[PDB]
């Protein structure tokens, strides 16, 4: 016994202690605490069956025990929800000795299940009597601490939670002590210290329960520490999913774009809360906030009930950021007119944000007007588009996209307009701007005699800050392919050009397998290499990938007429004619 109880003090040689106790039964099983010390070892190995097997032998004999063998009986009955037996064991423990603490605190936790039912007997009889018979008991100190938290006594919780921390030495108890001091200073907004308490609470005993993990994760919202918030909140879902633990990962949305590790879980939480309603308000906002990459109709539906949800709690006008974005959705839909109405009422609601230069409704109106001018371009109301664009540029000339959509509008008229000059001054205001810089050479695509000169005007932002630029390097491939179909291939010149375009296409192949204009380029150059049976297959791939590429319609029918498959070709020619572009495209009928 001396060496077996020596083992439990140090947390090791525990099966050795059980063996030396079982050495007692094979030398002298003449009294029960010889085998009850086996059962506490079994209990601490989470074997409550092996505990209670020896624990049946306690109460049949009941040696001289003021220490209440029935106390541990009830605690095993606390395990695996044998509660009614736990109550009866703690009761008879109190009848043998009401002075003992374990029975009263056991029933205190036992009635911690019902707080709204039987509050007072938990608070005073179940707890304050345990505080009376021992004011140094870190259980009852922790429980009066969390009661005082819920009773909003934030003073004496910090009187006695420190002692509840120091008087205990096991990790989970001092984890709960740090956690409770952390929740105390959290609602007291002393978050720097309470953060440390949350981290210590997690670090002491982690597998116990997940509230310290939640405390750290929400504490990482303080001080911008939110990277570990996601990692720590993952264990909350590893604990068990709840409505609570959706919104933390939803609002803490490191999912920006093409990042499914935060985005698929965002989808799961969003359809964890969409069916729910724990006073859902913004739940549809962060629904649609990821839906803009995805299906647009889901975003529409989210905004639809989101428009409603701002009206019932108070008849509050929808903020114009919502209304601008739903008009932006309808822009890529057929709902162009009510998209315009959305932008109008967006600008009005921004005007109704009369005093909100913190939120900068003026800047929101700037981008809203940008969207509305882009819409007027879709109306082909280029007059009012000019008006809105020059209104913004006369008030924010630092902006570039309005500066070049104007240029694009005159590009529709032609190249050497102020189209080309707005484009060049967009580089003058911002030479770092890759979109405008690409559009510079896009102008030069009109001048194909400026073919070999485009190496320089597509080299300027081949600086590696801009690299990798798939769009530009495919433009290099395209200006390199227009070099072909010349009588100099036999002179190995266009063969070198074919292989150089092939090298560009291999490069864009390796850096992107899923580009389709690339594969169109490979198939085109090998078709120029005379491999047309080797071309319809590679074009078939981009054909299922997306039919809505005007080029591949032509290039497939070129193969068809190369097998003289006219009755497969001209139909797909006029299928290419089903776009609203030009009633007689010339090269297509050629």
């Amino acid at each position: 016994l001396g060496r077996a109880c020596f083992c439990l003090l140090e947390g090791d040689k525990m099966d050795q202690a059980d063996a030396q106790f079982h050495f007692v039964l094979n030398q002298s099983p003449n009294n029960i605490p010889a085998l009850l010390g086996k059962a506490c070892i079994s209990f601490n190995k989470k074997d409550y069956r092996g505990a209670l097997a020896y624990y049946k032998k306690a109460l049949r004999t009941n040696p001289g025990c003021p220490a209440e063998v029935r106390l541990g009986m009830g605690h095993c009955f606390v395990k695996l929800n044998k509660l009614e037996k736990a109550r009866l064991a703690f009761s008879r423990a109190l009848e043998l000795n009401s002075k003992c603490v374990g029975a009263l605190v056991g029933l205190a936790v036992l009635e911690l299940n019902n707080k709204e039912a039987d509050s007072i007997k938990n608070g005073v009889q179940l707890l304050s009597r345990a505080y009376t018979i021992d004011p140094s008991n870190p259980m009852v100190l922790n429980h009066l601490a969390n009661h005082f938290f819920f009773k909003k006594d934030y003073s004496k919780v910090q009187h006695l939670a420190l002692h509840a921390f120091h008087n205990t030495e096991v990790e989970a108890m001092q984890a709960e002590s740090c956690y409770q001091l952390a929740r105390s200073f959290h609602v007291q907004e002393d978050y720097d210290q309470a953060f440390q308490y949350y981290y210590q609470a997690t670090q002491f005993a982690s597998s116990s329960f997940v509230l310290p993990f939640f405390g750290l994760g929400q504490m990482y919202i303080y001080r911008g520490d939110k990277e570990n918030a996601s990692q720590c909140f993952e264990k909350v879902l590893k604990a068990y999913p709840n409505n609570y633990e959706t919104m933390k990962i939803l609002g803490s949305l490191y999912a920006a774009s093409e990042d499914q590790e935060k985005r698929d879980i965002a989808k799961g939480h969003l359809k964890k809360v969409t069916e729910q309603y724990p006073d859902d308000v913004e739940a549809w906002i962060e629904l649609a906030q990821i839906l803009e990459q995805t299906d647009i109709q889901g975003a529409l539906s989210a905004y639809g009930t989101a428009t409603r949800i701002l009206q019932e709690k108070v008849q509050a006008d929808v903020p114009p950021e919502i209304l601008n974005n739903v008009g932006a959705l309808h822009f890529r839909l057929g709902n162009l007119g009510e998209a315009k109405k959305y932008f109008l009422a967006s600008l009005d609601r921004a005007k109704a944000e009369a005093e909100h230069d913190e939120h900068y409704y003026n800047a929101i109106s700037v981008t809203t007007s940008y969207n509305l001018a882009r819409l007027y371009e879709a109306m082909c109301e280029f007059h009012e588009a000019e008006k809105l664009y020059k209104n913004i540029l006369r008030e924010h000339p630092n902006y570039v996209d309005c500066y070049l959509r104007l240029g694009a509008m005159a590009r529709d008229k032609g190249n050497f307009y102020e189209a080309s000059d707005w484009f060049k001054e967009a580089l003058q205001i911002n030479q770092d701007h890759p979109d405008a810089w690409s559009l510079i050479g896009n102008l030069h695509l009109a001048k194909q005699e400026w073919g070999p000169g485009q190496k320089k005007f597509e080299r300027i932002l081949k600086q590696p800050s801009t690299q990798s630029d798939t769009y530009s390097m495919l433009a290099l491939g395209n200006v390199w392919l227009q070099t072909l179909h010349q009588p100099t291939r036999d002179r190995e010149k266009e063969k070198r050009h074919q292989d150089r375009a092939l090298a560009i296409y291999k490069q864009v192949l390796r850096n992107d397998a899923k580009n389709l204009y690339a594969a169109n380029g490979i198939g085109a150059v090998l078709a120029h290499k005379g491999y047309f049976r080797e071309a319809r297959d590679v074009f078939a791939q981009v054909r299922e990938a997306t039919a809505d590429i005007s080029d591949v319609w032509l290039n497939l029918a070129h193969i068809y007429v190369e097998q003289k498959q006219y009755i497969s070709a001209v139909q797909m020619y006029e299928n290419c004619l089903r776009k609203f572009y030009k009633h007689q495209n010339t090269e297509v009928v050629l």
């Binding site: 040696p63 025990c65 929740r183 509230l211």
Partner: protein, 64 residues
């Protein structure tokens, strides 16, 4: 984007997730009893033995 409040604070509260937790009793790692074969100076095994009705219904494992 929407200007979301930074939710650095709990007011719902998590109390549904909190009081659902039933709290362990680990005051003494051998389950709140001094384990001793010397302090039983007394024994009820002598005449007469004592066994309350609550004590018989705790002598069962699960018989309800």
């Amino acid at each position: 984007t929407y200007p979301f409040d930074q939710n650095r604070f709990v007011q719902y509260k998590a109390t549904s997730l909190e009081k659902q937790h039933k709290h362990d009793l680990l005051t003494e790692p051998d389950l709140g009893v001094t384990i001793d074969l010397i302090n039983p100076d007394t024994y009820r095994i002598d005449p007469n033995v004592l066994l309350d009705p609550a004590d018989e219904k705790l002598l069962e494992e699960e018989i309800q």
